[PDB]
């Protein structure tokens, strides 16, 4: 940890790798049925 931004950038990749939650809050699931 030091001037390392890979912390927020990496974080953004993980959430983006598990959009099952946000997707559930959007029509994204009306097709996953």
Contacts of 19 (CB under 8 A, 6+ apart): 28
Longest dimension (CA), the chain: 44
Hey, what long-range contacts does 7-14 have (CB within 8 A, 24 or more apart)?
none
Residue 7 and residue 1 in contact, taking contact as beta carbons nearer than 8 Å: yes
Tell me which method was used to determine the 3D structure: NMR
Angle, CA of 31, 32 and 33, to the nearest 5°: 90
């Amino acid at each position: 940890t030091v001037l390392s931004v890979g912390g927020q950038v990496n974080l953004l990749i993980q959430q983006a790798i598990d959009p099952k939650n946000l997707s559930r809050l959007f029509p994204g699931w009306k097709a996953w049925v």
